[PDB]
Symmetry: D2
Subunit: 461 residues, 4 copies
């Protein structure tokens, strides 16, 4: 092809077709202004053409997938084998050979599309868990390419990873890259250990730094760089948007519609068993029972965005959460006044930002999360320095957002203590924490993340 | 004893101790003003004295029961064997011999207390399913007594009744009475058939009338009268109470607190799997999904009063209903505006009456109910002739309240159609139905019921 | 058509194609030798021709059904709505309007095939629950026809039947017949009461006799005869077959393969939740635990024939029974010697008969069964007068086989007592019972049943 | 006290009281012949005296525990918090603060008993997961003592360990020892990493060897040694016992009682969800369905010894396994001939050894196991060099028994392939593997293990 910079991801950065706002595609904008860039991904419609589509500063290469392909490669292998395994087997992974075989076939198809688009000596950046075979497949097809890979979800400990019948094929797949990145040093170090134990490769033994002090795996003639690059958001843009009059007006209206509570707790999550929504609800219920939260002036809003309905674990999870909601309101609410407001639906960006601005306490309590950008978005939105962030230790975000109220979500007593603390914090203490969190998030944004990964990758040449 | 009229019931008509208002004890007030009356029952506290307590127009004879007695006779046999069996095995009855043995022991203890209180030739009125052995036991102890029995729950068809390992002992128990009454002719006719089939007794073969045309079972020397007497409420008193200023003011306030909806649907039930609460919620959810009910101006309030928490079926039922509530609000509500308000708690009388007055549509959809007084209470409260009653055919009330919107709760399509019809009825049609329902309920009150049963019983002398 | 006697049933009396042995088609053989007979039914293959097929003493009229037709009319309405409802809602019926609509369509299609085959003034005999609309539909199409209907499953009490949203359509459907027959007077009497209550028809009020003392329903100009005709088997043929040398040799071999136990208990059932297989296993387990059955010389063989695998209730039931089997053997067996032998597969006729001959105790403990021919087959096979029959009261068979050891399957204590009694009966007592049972079964065979129904039907002319 | 060598373990090495044979107490016999030894542990009876009991070469110090103590410290914290967590959360750990508090109290009580028994400068060896706080508690009470700790179960990866609300207290507890040992280098390395990450201690960074190349944790003034010492059995004694005439005769009798199968597969396990019994049964069932195992000449015997019945996970597991057994026999067995023989009961040593000798294929397929001595016992018993060992990679045993047929139990396709391979191996290949396995197990016995740990501990002085 004629592209010297190519992004490979499960989906094209579009929706219907119009280019999707924000995210990775926006972070890379100034690079695309200096490169001949291309994006390889599934257009999100079944059995479509693979004809390249010129869309501004990108050429888009659509990967043809059937509904059956999506069911077995994505809904299957990716979301019901890899996802639960990598997230500390919160639910039991399903090991299915037909899913594996389709995952291989689809990965090869992404690899072929990438080669089709990539010019000689081009830099290629492959994204996430659904495409872990692509780097090896691409290097075999195109040994001239410089290949980076970034995993957006946790990389599990070796004791769990080893369950995968195709553990070696996945590992070799990743080792096809010149640079393998994770959010956290822990993931990088697990990968180094896996390389030694499973593949018998020689690796570096030192701790892995943040955006520095990289690890190495020796694979015959070449070296694989291994690093930690924690993702972030466009902090400055969110900070700007949350200041808009219409957003502030909507935040006031939200509080009014809730019957002007003294305190609003807020949860915002893609519905997933990794997110610890059940833990929040349990803690809230027990605090109400104990009279430690005032049922007359405190309300919990949980916004769950629909996710992966075709996967049974997610339907069962939705059932459990919805029971908790009904139960808590039946026990502690009044007619015309729930203590929990729960919505299961997509939330427009402007509405989400209004909720961040309205919320006195942000509850981000995942059991295991790669990063969790919601936590960072909340911080960026609170330029008024109001609010409080309650944050699980088991998110990548906790390594950076140490001034938040950190919790072990498995320690329910301390989750409860912490929610009371956040709800009753002095104005000054809340400001101290939020100022410190904002200093971190404003300085460590998605631009820094992307430049750091690309600088590390370029250095492998 | 020195009492010539004795009521026997599971519980004394008191609570703490102060005499409980309304109900059977109030209906019998003018009779107690002319008789030396007594009431035999468990005082509701474990291991208490059985010393007679003079309380105004009654002498109270407390029956001593241990917590273990209550667990096996009441929670066990009564509520987990007899209750589900008599209500068309909506859940599976548990047949347990230890429960049976305790049920026999406790019944004998009620019988002994009754004899202790009853003067020679006294009239005795035994109440309900928990005490079905008492009439036979009492006749053996005291053949001088005139004994009536009234079953407040349905009497099941013979095909189901026959499951009971102690079917014959229960039947003989009832046949100890001079008069056996049920709400409905159907129950009386089942009893007649059971007597012939199981006990081989000679009975009348004709249809049984309402408060007339009684059936007969020949038991050796004596005849057992069998009748249908549908219970009711103190219609005039409720009609009066619902007109009070404070009640009307509270009804307006309820509508205001719900965000002034155009239409309020109301369910009020003791939480029980017989009540068809799940059916209401399913119908409401599907109407919302279909856009046949407006989620912006219509709200459903369900008031569930706690019941029988020590029985697993009831805890499981509560879980299912609470899931439906959470689910429906998550799907169709807005923050600050649920489409379903659900409370699980006792409701004070004045509050309940305010809800009846506020409610545009009363949803009474049991799978199987002896009578259902909530339906009649709603009618009595609507002297403004507003509102609409949606009523299951499978309640005793449906035989009298034919002008309501009757439904087969198993026919979900028609339940849905009917809820739309009730919600959108013309003012005139609603008034026509409510006027007709009130004529019935005002004329057929608990006084008529009690006099009719007692006249039938007295006639057996 | 040219047929003056027509049988209508869900399936043709064939299999692949060769004519199926025994059953109704064999019972009617001497009638077919004097009539121009035809059989209407589904050939058991999807989307086949409806071309008449001359097969000896019958003309076969195949009804075309799609796999979707079978799924919704048969697997759906028939087996998941009607079957559980008619059998005392042992599992919850599913009420589904699409299933109903297909059931109507298919019934009409059977009606049209029947008219196609039937000559003027022909006698038509419609069979079973899957075809309850046919008599009315046929009378409308062909008012010249004489129509009989026989229900092979129980007819439920009115309190349960009334759940059916299409209760009236089913009842009108049956009332299209000149004669409606059931195994038992109880079913006939339920039908009479249903006719009065639901349809408001004038009926006879007397008890219904066995093959006599028929009931009547007046339907405008015409009268519907209602009767009880308990089905049976070809007793003499089974008696003859069980005497064959090869059968007796196989029975000895069975005992040898079981390690020559002193006592063999046997269950033989189509796998169904109506059959009470779980109750047998529970009783056996508790007797072993109590040391009341000797685990060293007593063995239980349960033969379950596969049934209705596409219906979830049946898969769940299979799971429960299979757990009980594993559990009991794990607790009381030895390596090389189970106390329970369980097979889930079809059993050839000759093998079944060998098991009847080998079995010391036949366990037939259904919760609810129309008749249960297995009980009668066992009796007919025991010309040696050995063995013992333990029989649920809730089978139609119990009305005739009173000399068996009758049990209420809900009374587990008495089921256990009875199994011990049957296992330890004196030789003389066992012979007394078996002689008496055989006298009944040899005299009341399928020939008597069929002649009695056809005589009653002919009499309606 | 007067003891210079003290073993601390959850239970005393006795049963009723007579001293229990084999195990750790027998391995230490020659050391006790040269030391003044004592054993601290719960005598296995509730609320007993703590009076020292002289029993030969040991003084026994009984720890008083109530039934409530056992319920919360052992059944609770140990078996329902720590056990599932350490075994890769195969089931969800329960985090309960009351259990934790009792675990602390009981550990302190073991510590106090130990100090009571231990002379100045005595060597103390604490055993297993139930007593992880003892080393720290003991060092505080008795800083003169030399303390070793050996964990008999896996030490989990840090990502899972960190879930424990009391993670730091457990880690500090272990760090109270002079020597911390695990079966495997993996456990030692997890512990080293945990020490750095959670406790911030300076550790060695190198790989940990087997019985060599020890790790170190620096804790202020002192160093903690960390090592891997894989436990084993008394190989020579088992080898001798399996040669006894009566054992060989019983093995022949077992095959005869199974109907002289060509091949016997054997599973022997304490019933536990870690053991992968469900996987064996699934593989066997699918091989039968596929016709890859001959249902006429191949049989599977599973011996499950009862374990932890008071823990719900274990009762649920038993239910699942027992269903599989019933199902497989129903599908593939014949009357008088199951394909699976399953016993749930304790098995006497001599009987177990006879089964090892009879078994053609030993199936040891745990999901996660510290070591698994059953695998080694089988090997030691096969001096005839017959048999085959199918062994999960996820057992500590797999690191030593590499010549067995190793499987990933999550890779069901390969488990199935491997069972066919083991069943059909040539005599020569089977002998080659068994000879090699025996060389390892005969040379690496429990004596070597115990001397190696004690030499390492002594070296810390």
């Amino acid at each position: 092809g004629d592209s010297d910079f190519v992004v490979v991801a499960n989906r094209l950065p579009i929706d219907l077709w119009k280019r999707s706002p924000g995210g990775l595609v926006t972070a890379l904008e100034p690079l695309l202004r200096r490169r001949r860039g291309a994006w390889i991904g599934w257009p999100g419609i079944p059995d479509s053409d693979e004809d390249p589509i010129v869309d501004g500063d990108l050429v888009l290469y659509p990967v043809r997938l059937s509904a059956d392909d999506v069911a077995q490669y994505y809904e299957g292998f990716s979301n019901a084998t890899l996802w639960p395994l990598y997230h500390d087997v919160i639910v039991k992974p399903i090991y299915n050979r037909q899913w594996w075989e389709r995952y291989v076939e689809v990965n090869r198809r992404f690899a072929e599309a990438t080669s089709r688009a990539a010019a000689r000596g081009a830099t290629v950046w492959v994204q996430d868990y659904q495409l872990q075979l692509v780097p090896k497949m691409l290097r075999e097809l195109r040994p001239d390419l410089t290949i980076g890979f970034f995993l957006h979800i946790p990389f599990p400990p070796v004791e769990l990873f080893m369950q995968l019948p195709w553990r070696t094929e996945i590992t070799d797949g990743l080792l096809g890259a010149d640079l393998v990145g994770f959010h956290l040093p822990g993931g990088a170090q697990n990968f180094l250990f896996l390389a030694r134990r499973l593949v018998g490769a020689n690796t570096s033994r030192a701790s892995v730094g943040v955006r520095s002090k990289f690890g190495e795996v020796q694979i015959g003639s070449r070296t694989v760089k291994v690093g930690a690059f924690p993702i972030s958001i466009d902090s400055a843009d969110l900070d700007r948007q949350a200041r808009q009059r219409s957003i502030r007006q909507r935040a006031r209206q939200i509080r009014a519609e809730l019957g002007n509570p003294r305190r609003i707790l807020l949860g915002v999550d893609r519905l997933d068993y990794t997110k610890g929504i059940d833990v929040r609800l349990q803690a809230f219920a027990e605090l109400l029972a104990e009279g430690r939260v005032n049922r007359e002036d405190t309300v919990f809003v949980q916004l769950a965005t629909p996710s992966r309905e075709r996967v049974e674990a997610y339907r069962l999870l939705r059932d459990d959460i919805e029971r908790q909601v009904g139960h808590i309101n039946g026990e502690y609410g009044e007619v015309g006044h729930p203590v929990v407001h729960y919505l299961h639906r997509p939330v427009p960006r402007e509405e989400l930002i209004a909720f961040f601005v309205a919320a006195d306490v942000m509850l981000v309590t995942p059991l295991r999360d790669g990063m969790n950008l919601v936590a960072k978005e909340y911080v960026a939105c609170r330029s008024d320095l109001g609010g409080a962030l309650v944050l699980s230790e088991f998110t990548g975000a906790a390594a950076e957002l140490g001034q938040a109220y950190l919790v072990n979500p498995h320690n329910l007593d301390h989750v409860k203590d912490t929610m009371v603390a956040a709800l009753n914090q002095t104005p000054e203490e809340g400001r101290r924490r939020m100022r410190a969190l904002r200093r971190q998030v404003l300085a460590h944004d998605v631009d820094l993340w992307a430049r750091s990964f690309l600088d590390a990758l370029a250095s492998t040449r």
